[PDB]
């Protein structure tokens, strides 16, 4: 297991435009296209991201290309965020993957309210962090995924992903 395999499990792979858990147009391995309710707008974003007229369909290779970009960009972002970098740097590689997973799903703005969880993670208070992480919209809306990510933070193992 690693961050790519972990997110592939959590996000799936679909080659046609679909709506994510929040109802937003998405393709590939959780590549968010836009929050616009306009399918035409999503198709434009897709064509821009891929560099050809896709008509809303891509290949597995193209999906994997966007995915690698999205994972890389999520990491680079964390490192650019003064609140997130110190916690990320304090973690082992397995828990870093859990961190990347959350930022991939919700963005840096999506984790702005996780200040108290972040402190507990920095303190390596793993069971307390795990309890705090679940007191969230995130957990309530996507509990099965959140349970996997939280177990990863709690244990520093890949047990939740087999
Ligand atoms: C950079 C980073 C470290 C640990 C967790 C998260 C996700 N949000 N929370 N808690 C981000």
Q: Which residue has the tokens 């290949």?
A: 59
Q: Catalytic: 20? A: yes
Matching residue, tokens 């193992």: 157
Fold for the domain defined by 1-162: Lysozyme (1.10.530)
* Short-list 41, 44, 19, CA closest to 32: 19
Catalytic, 92? Answer no
160 lines ligand 1 (CB under 6 A): no
Beta pairing partners, 25: 19
Both structure tokens of 67: 């995915």
Distance separating alpha carbons of residues 23 and 18, to the nearest angstrom: 9
- H/E run at residue 16: strand 14-19
CB 23 within 8 A of CB 32: no
Q: Residue with the nearest Cα to atom 8 of ligand 1?
A: 111
Quote the ligand 1 centre to 114 CA distance (angstroms). 7
Distance CA 99, CA 3 (A): 10
Beta-bridge mates of residue 14: 28
Report the C-alpha gap between 1 and 156 in whole angstroms. 12
User: Method of determination?
Assistant: X-ray
Query: What is the rounded end-to-end Cα distance, in angstroms, of the chain?
Result: 8
> Catalytic: which of 10, 11, 62, 70?
11
Distances in whole angstroms, Cα of residue 34 to Cα of each of 18, 19, 29: 11, 10, 15
- Cβ of 146 below 6 Å from ligand 1: no
Q: List, in order, residues 6 or more apart from 130 with CB less than 8 Å away.
A: 150, 151, 153, 154
Angle, helices 143-155 vs 3-11, to 10°: value is: 160
State residue 31 phi and psi, 5-degree precision.
-85, 100
- Index of the ligand 1 atom closest to the CA of residue 81: 1
CB 118 near ligand 1, within 6 Å: yes
Minimal CA–CA distance to 3: which of 68, 62, 82? Answer: 68
Minimum CA distance residue for ligand 1 atom 6: 99
């Amino acid at each position: 297991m690693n961050i790519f395999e972990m997110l592939r499990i959590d996000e799936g792979l679909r080659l046609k435009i679909y709506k994510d858990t929040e109802g937003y147009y998405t393709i590939g391995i959780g590549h968010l296209l836009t929050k616009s309710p306009s399918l035409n707008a999503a198709k434009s974003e897709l064509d821009k991201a891929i560099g050809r007229n896709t008509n809303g369909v891509i290949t597995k290779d193209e999906a994997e290309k966007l995915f690698n970009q999205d994972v890389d960009a999520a990491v680079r972002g964390i490192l650019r965020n003064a609140k997130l970098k110190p916690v990320y740097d304090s973690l082992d590689a397995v828990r870093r993957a859990a961190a990347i997973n959350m930022v991939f799903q919700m963005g840096e703005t999506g984790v702005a309210g996780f200040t108290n969880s972040l402190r507990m993670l920095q303190q390596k208070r793993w069971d307390e962090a795990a309890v705090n992480l679940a007191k969230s919209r995130w957990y309530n809306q996507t509990p099965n995924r959140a349970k996997r990510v939280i177990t990863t933070f709690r244990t520093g193992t890949w047990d939740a992903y087999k």
